[model samples]
Target: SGAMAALTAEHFAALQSLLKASSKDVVRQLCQESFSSSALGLKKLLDVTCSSLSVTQEEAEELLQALHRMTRLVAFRDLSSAEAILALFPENFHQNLKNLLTKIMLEHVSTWRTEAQAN
Candidate 1:
């Protein structure tokens, strides 16, 4: 049990350091309440969000905002104390979330291209 405790502590410390390295204050305030409990964590959130929204330059900005929220939450909240408020969502949430993000990204890309062509 001691070894497991020590390893957990080390992992927590590493996560904390990474969080600090990745986040700012405003971002932390938002996502701190959303993702405090899930195993998906900030990294997974950022990865999925970015992957789901990388279709256009405008969507990239939205992805950045989402990532900033995640980073800030991870930086401000203690790993031991954080509880994921949004983790209670159903299993299909991931698919739905990703699909929504992708749809938004495609819409943005299409709009941008149309505007550019008109200009």
Candidate 2:
């Protein structure tokens, strides 16, 4: 097996955009309670994530769900949001990822619309 390429500046840029687009509470879910709510915090988390391959998928799912929720919440957002987020993931998982995302997003959509109607 070859060496895993380290996450580069572009990766960080994408990650930053994803996080910045979401609520602060999303970051708290992915990071340590005491971790700074900044770019560096993501770097540390990403580093630790990359260092150990499989386990990070679990944490990364937190990112995935937040992204999906944000995508659904942002009215009229495009599939590009889905594409860009999936770009960060392995292609093999794409099929399963979208399948899962579709289900999760619809569930949130149902709840959100109900809450909106209630207000």
Give the best candidate by lDDT.
2
What pairs collide in candidate 2? none
Looking at candidate 2, what is the lDDT of residue 1?
A: 19
State, as a TM-score between 0 and 1, how close model 2 is to the true structure.
0.28
What C-alpha root-mean-square deviation, in Å, does candidate 1 show against the real structure? Answer: 17.8
Q: Per-residue alpha-carbon lDDT of model 1 for 24-92, expressed as tens digits? A: 332333234223424344344554333443334334334344433333332333222213323212343
Q: Candidate 2 at 110: error in angstroms? A: 1.8
Each model's C-alpha lDDT? 0.33, 0.37
Cα deviation of 10, candidate 1, in Å: 34
lDDT of 2: 0.37
Candidate 1 has an lDDT of 0.33
Q: Positional deviation of 41 in candidate 1, in angstroms?
A: 23
